[PDB]
């Protein structure tokens, strides 16, 4: 069964005595029904909807990396509402292994 990543004792040693877990808010903000503008026509309302996607949002950490919106299933990865053609580029399921080949490295 999965019980999280394994941690070694040395990995828990801080480089400063004042380090504490970062208090970054992972609440993306306050939302409601997407509110369109009467002036926007069909094309521009589509742009408005595409700019309100929660799955395009993320939280930036203190080192510049971002933790994105993540889901257990790919149903939450398409634009909401679902467009006619969703996965133009095949989603990549990344597996990890310890195998390696010499061609990838250079000395």
């Amino acid at each position: 069964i999965y019980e999280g990543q394994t941690v070694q004792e040395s990995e828990l040693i801080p480089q400063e005595d004042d380090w504490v877990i970062e208090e970054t808010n992972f609440c993306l903000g306050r939302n409601c029904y997407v509110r369109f503008r009467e002036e926007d026509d069909l094309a521009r309302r589509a742009l408005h909807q595409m700019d309100s996607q929660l799955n395009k949002m993320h939280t930036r950490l203190r080192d510049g990396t971002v933790i994105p919106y993540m889901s257990f299933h790919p149903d939450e990865m398409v634009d909401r509402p679902a467009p006619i053609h969703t996965f133009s580029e095949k989603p990549l399921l990344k597996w990890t292994w310890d195998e390696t080949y010499e061609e990838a490295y250079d000395d």
Partner: protein
């Protein structure tokens, strides 16, 4: 275009839309029944027109199963998200997907047209001969609908099985539920078609299979060989939805994924070899009855494992997250309701207990708790979970605690008394009844009128 569209997501919406439309007729038929059963004596159906009541119950059962719940759970949600849950773009067989929904509509039009034009008589949704083969042409029309519906079901099953070839990700629990349901259809539908043809042969080709020296019990075996897998075909997609909702809304990985998958597989294998618990009262051999009774109880073992795995999904979830969302409430309500329906199923699995409870309203309440509450609520829960993806609006259902509470209270009022009535005893498929069963029937009737009013509040 609107009819020429092959997009699977559009077709998924059409399945949901069509099920709601047909649902109104099913609800009307259901409402006619409880109004009549309010008290002894005719209320809205003349004594000289008792044949109409038999048609109402026959259509209520048929429409709700084949035209409402099955398209909703096996045609609607799966066609929308299944290709998305898989990493593929669209359904494998786009043109077949289009014709399947059109076939469902045409069969519906044939059925309702038969109500208007043919004489109205009924033989139950199970169409037991010889009663089914001595009836009028409305029975012929209903057979055409079922056969036509069978074509759509099988081709849709073929469509989902092809996902195994093209799936570019992991087979999630939900995908397994649809795949195994397709397998059940592939193995059970051809048997149904064969026996239905024999019914047509007697009705229309002067066949003598269902007269003396021809065993009428032959029909019951072949029909229920498809009949029970059908109820498991209805519920298995509901199980898949519950697994997704509970995991997603609690931010918890599905526990025992492989146990869940194997439970679904086990249920299908067992569900294909226990059909004769519908035939306890016909006088089967002693050893035959013991076998089916023993194997029927075994179905609870895999079904129980899924229940417990669901419970641990909800346990321990973060308190800060708001738990009043309608989708979450419905998913939790399903566990509570399904346990009631399943436990009563185990009670009526014991054949000696079943002798008293066969063809009584206890059996009605048994399958209503599972289907009318559980399956509907699972279908509602799935649609609510996908509200943003689907994009429908103009309803107040996402956060509506009144609707959930009122629905739960009132549906329980309809069907809890029917358990009590079963021991009293009141037979099924009956219009009049003795005066001393009025109190319980009256309470359920008040429950039925109340539920219909609640539906108007969502808009």
């Amino acid at each position: 275009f609107y009819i020429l569209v092959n997009n699977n997501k559009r077709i998924g919406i059409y399945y949901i839309k069509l099920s709601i439309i047909i649902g109104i007729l099913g609800i009307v038929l259901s409402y006619i029944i409880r109004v009549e059963l309010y008290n002894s004596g005719n209320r809205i159906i003349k004594y000289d027109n008792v044949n109409y009541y038999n048609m109402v119950i026959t259509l209520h059962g048929l429409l709700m199963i084949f035209y409402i719940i099955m398209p909703g759970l096996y045609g609607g949600i799966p066609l929308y998200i299944l290709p998305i849950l898989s990493v593929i773009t669209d359904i494998v067989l786009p043109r077949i997907n289009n014709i399947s929904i059109i076939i469902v509509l045409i069969s519906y039009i044939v059925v309702i047209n038969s109500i208007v034009i043919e004489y109205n008589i009924g033989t139950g949704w199970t169409l037991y001969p010889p009663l089914s083969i001595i009836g009028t042409v409305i029975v012929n029309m209903i057979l055409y609908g079922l056969i036509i519906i069978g074509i759509s079901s099988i081709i849709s099953a073929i469509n989902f099985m092809n996902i195994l070839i093209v799936i570019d990700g992991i087979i999630y629990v939900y995908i397994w539920s649809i795949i195994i349901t397709s397998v059940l259809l592939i193995i059970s539908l051809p048997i149904l078609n064969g026996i239905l043809l024999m019914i047509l042969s007697d009705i229309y080709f002067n066949s003598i299979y269902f007269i003396l020296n021809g065993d009428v019990v032959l029909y019951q075996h072949l029909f229920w060989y498809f009949g029970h897998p059908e109820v498991y075909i209805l519920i298995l997609p509901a199980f898949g939805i519950i697994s997704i909702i509970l995991s997603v809304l609690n931010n918890k990985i599905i526990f025992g994924m492989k146990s869940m998958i194997l439970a679904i597989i086990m249920i299908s294998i067992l569900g294909s070899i226990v059909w004769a618990h519908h035939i306890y009262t016909v006088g089967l051999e002693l050893d035959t009855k013991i076998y089916f009774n023993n194997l029927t109880l075994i179905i609870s073992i895999p079904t129980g494992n899924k229940i417990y795995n669901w419970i641990i999904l909800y346990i321990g979830s973060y308190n800060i997250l708001y738990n009043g969302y309608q989708s979450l409430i419905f998913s939790i309500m399903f566990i509570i309701i399904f346990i009631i329906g399943g436990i009563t199923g185990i009670i009526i699995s014991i054949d000696i207990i079943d002798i008293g409870l066969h063809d009584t309203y206890y059996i009605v309440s048994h399958f209503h708790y599972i289907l009318s509450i559980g399956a509907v609520i699972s279908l509602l829960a799935g649609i609510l979970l996908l509200k943003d993806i689907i994009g429908y609006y103009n309803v107040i259902i996402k956060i509506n605690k009144y609707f959930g509470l009122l629905l739960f209270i009132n549906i329980n009022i309809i069907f809890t008394p029917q358990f009590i009535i079963g021991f009293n005893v009141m037979p099924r498929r009956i219009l009049e009844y003795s005066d001393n069963i009025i109190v319980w029937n009256l309470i359920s009737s008040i429950g039925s009128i109340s539920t219909i009013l609640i539906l108007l509040s969502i808009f």
